[PDB]
Design a protein around this ligand. Structure first.
Ligand SMILES: Nc1ncnc2c1ncn2[C@@H]1O[C@H](COP(=O)(O)OP(=O)(O)OP(=O)(O)O)[C@@H](O)[C@H]1O
Ligand SMILES: [Mg+2]
Lengths: 102, 49, 48, 70, 404, 26
């Protein structure tokens, strides 16, 4: 019982948190600086945190920026447009292969 | 002198007995409730609010 | 196979350098950095 | 104490919140959603919503202040 | 000095000249591998045994903190007074900001991007370069694999294009003595499936200048002002670099007759075409840039793109004759194991209408049909089946010999 | 002359918002 309530309390604690922006990288820079392009508008030069190495960073990727002070947060799945839903059939409850006949 | 001004928008569909989806003129849309004594029968989709 | 793999590795181990901020020689900075540049952010305003 | 904690967690979405639209899911309890005001965001998700309803796109609810997905 | 050669070539070493399972190749690639491992080891020791570091001069951190941590990028537009320039942000909001020291007040010029602070919004630096990731991506850096050895015999065309794009670089003594400007524009036209892109690949494989490659229906954006600006930046980045060359493929998507009609999007297409047309040969200068432009139908082009002065040489690729078919067959089946029975004479002479890609497909189909019955060596009947059973869609004409 | 035509698009300019000034003048 104690473990269960502790877990729930911690989750509630975490939900009280601020969001973050997502940004496109155009190129890295020297001495821990990146050049990013925030979605609404802007062209910023931002700093990385301690848990990410620059060599992970390459042009045209998605990074998360802390909204409080514009720092690199992490690197996340690369871009795609909205039209991928109709593409890549995900389940195939389809016909078999032997009912063709001829 | 103490009035406030208010946003004008339109009711989209009704969602549940107390929840409505509404949209501003040029802002985003929102999910909202409806006030005390407000005769909800009038709240047809498309009405001005 | 391992040729191309080590190619990938050797190219990643290389990135770039910039030195493109336009900073002047330190003599031009003078001690003006503290004296008036520090005393220039707060006194003025943007004035659109 | 457990009862009281559930009581607090219940009143986290009974708020006049905003509609976004789902964009992508990265891993468990985390996603990327673009709000109707532009400004594409990246936020946790609540621990009680069913997962298999949000693959390609959807009308999702976003907390007014924290942008937490509900 | 401009950005210089900026060469684009991996091209490690091709010598696999044995082209079989011989020892020479094994020892040679052994040498290649051990040199590459040696260089990797050197760079590891270079990065591992660095003992010296202070790198702050007790003031670099001072300048770093004086400027804000999340610096933003803006566009200078005027400089009315010293220490009081005027800049603007993205949204077009100007601000009468100040100019601080520690910024070389030499290289700033109206229209150049600058680095600005947040809280006070003054100018704190200059951004050296700004190229969007739609033009740097067009560039090539790993050369494609082919070379002149694979071409099936086009001596006239090869010699022509070599005098066009390659010769003025290596041996530029003659042209000055004669007093001529070498040609700058080339069109490659003809039926489909003949080799127009092979010469592009082969030229890009062996060169010394920068190579830029663009496909036709890509110079188009929807915001009414991006097309022509992107074209202008393309030519700017080409010219600031080395003696580069640009390859525009499948043009007819861009240039077609410039007529007058109703819709605004088509007006945008025409506007972009016309901007490129100016860029290539307009007012004062052109620079040291060559342009190759490839298409499979030519009559539907605007007469203003083709006139000499803008495009100086036109090169037609015709269907192969019986001399060339033997060369093509000899090339595409070189690395094939093959039986003593077959004679390519019958295949080349029986038909009189086919092209390079067609020959390649015949080769692969025949080899696969030989595999079908659990064999490796190829025989004559396999080639017969390959030619006749598929690889032929048909057409009709001149019925029943009205002429005799 | 029937129509199957198309067109381009201009952007939406309205994007700016005010922000709290943080001048430090004594
Ligand atoms: N003379 C030749 N020697 C060797 N290979 C050839 C020759 N002519 C054609 N080929 C073959 O043709 C193909 C090259 O494509 P090609 O350059 O003909 O296309 P294209 O003319 O650009 O066609 P499209 O109109 O489809 O774009 C390769 O498979 C190449 O092997
Ligand atoms: Mg082609």
């Amino acid at each position: 019982l104690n473990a269960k309530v502790r877990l729930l309390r911690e989750e509630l604690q975490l939900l009280q948190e601020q969001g973050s922006y997502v940004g496109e990288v155009v190129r890295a820079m020297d001495k821990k600086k990146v050049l990013v392009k925030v979605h609404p508008e802007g062209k910023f030069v931002v700093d990385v945190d301690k848990n990410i190495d620059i060599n992970d960073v390459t042009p045209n990727c998605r990074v998360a920026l802390r909204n409080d002070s514009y720092t690199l947060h992490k690197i996340l799945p690369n871009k795609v447009d909205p039209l991928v839903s109709l593409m890549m059939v995900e389940k195939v409850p389809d016909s078999t292969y032997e009912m063709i006949g001829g | 002198l103490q009035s406030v001004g208010q946003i004008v928008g339109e009711v989209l569909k009704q969602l549940t007995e107390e929840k409505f989806i509404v949209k501003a003129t040029n802002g985003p849309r929102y999910v909202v409730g409806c006030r005390r004594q407000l005769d909800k029968s009038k709240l047809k989709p498309g009405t001005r609010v | 196979d391992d040729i191309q793999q080590l190619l990938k590795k050797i190219n990643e181990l290389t990135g770039i350098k910039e030195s493109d901020t336009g900073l002047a020689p330190p003599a031009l900075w003078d001690l003006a950095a503290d004296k008036q540049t520090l005393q220039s952010e707060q006194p003025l305003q943007v004035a659109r | 104490e457990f009862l009281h904690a559930q009581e607090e967690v219940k009143r986290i979405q009974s708020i006049p919140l905003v509609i976004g639209q789902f964009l992508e899911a990265v891993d468990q309890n985390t996603a990327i959603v673009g709000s109707t005001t532009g400004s594409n965001y990246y936020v946790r998700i609540l621990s009680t919503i069913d997962r298999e309803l949000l693959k390609p796109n959807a009308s999702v609810a976003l907390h007014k202040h924290s942008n937490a997905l509900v | 000095k401009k950005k210089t050669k900026g060469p684009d070539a991996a091209s490690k070493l091709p010598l696999v000249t044995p082209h079989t399972q011989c020892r020479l190749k094994l020892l040679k690639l052994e040498r290649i591998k051990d040199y590459l491992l040696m260089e990797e080891e050197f760079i590891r020791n270079q990065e591992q045994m660095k003992p010296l570091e202070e790198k702050q001069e007790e003031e670099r951190s001072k300048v770093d903190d004086l400027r804000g941590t999340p610096m933003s990028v803006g566009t200078l537009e005027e400089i009315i007074d010293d220490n009081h320039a005027i800049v603007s942000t993205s949204v077009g909001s100007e601000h009468y900001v100040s100019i601080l020291s520690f910024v070389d007040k030499d290289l700033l010029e109206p229209g150049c991007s600058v680095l600005l602070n947040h809280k006070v919004h003054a100018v704190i630096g200059v951004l050296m370069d700004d190229t969007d990731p739609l033009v740097t991506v067009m560039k090539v850096e790993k050369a494609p694999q082919e070379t002149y050895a694979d071409i099936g015999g086009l001596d006239n065309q090869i010699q022509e294009i070599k005098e066009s794009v390659e010769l003025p670089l290596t041996h530029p003594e003659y042209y000055e003595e004669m007093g001529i400007k070498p040609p700058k524009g080339v069109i490659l036209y003809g039926p489909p499936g003949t080799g127009k892109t092979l010469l592009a690949k082969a030229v890009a494989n062996q060169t010394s200048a920068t190579f830029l490659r663009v496909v036709g229906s890509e110079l188009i954006q929807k915001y009414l002002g991006d097309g022509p600006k992107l074209v202008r930046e393309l030519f700017r980045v080409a010219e600031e670099h080395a003696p580069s060359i640009v390859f525009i493929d499948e043009i007819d998507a861009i240039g077609t007759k410039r007529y007058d009609s109703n819709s605004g999007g088509e007006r945008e297409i025409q506007r972009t075409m016309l901007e490129l047309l100016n860029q290539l040969d307009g007012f004062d200068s052109r620079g040291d840039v060559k342009v190759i432009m490839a298409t499979n139908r030519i009559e539907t082009l605007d007469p203003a793109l083709i006139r000499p002065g803008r495009i100086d040489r036109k090169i037609e690729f015709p269907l192969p004759d019986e001399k060339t078919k033997k060369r093509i067959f000899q090339i595409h089946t070189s690395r094939m194991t093959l039986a003593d029975d077959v004679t390519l004479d019958d295949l080349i002479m029986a038909k009189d209408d086919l092209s390079g890609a067609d020959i390649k497909a015949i080769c692969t189909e025949a080899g696969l049909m030989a595999l079908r019955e659990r064999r490796m060596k190829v025989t004559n009947e396999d080639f017969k089946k390959s030619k006749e059973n598929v690889l032929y869609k048909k057409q009709e004409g001149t019925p029943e010999g009205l002429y005799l | 002359q029937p129509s199957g035509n198309t067109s381009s698009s201009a952007l939406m300019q309205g994007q700016r918002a005010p922000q709290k000034p943080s001048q430090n003048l004594v």
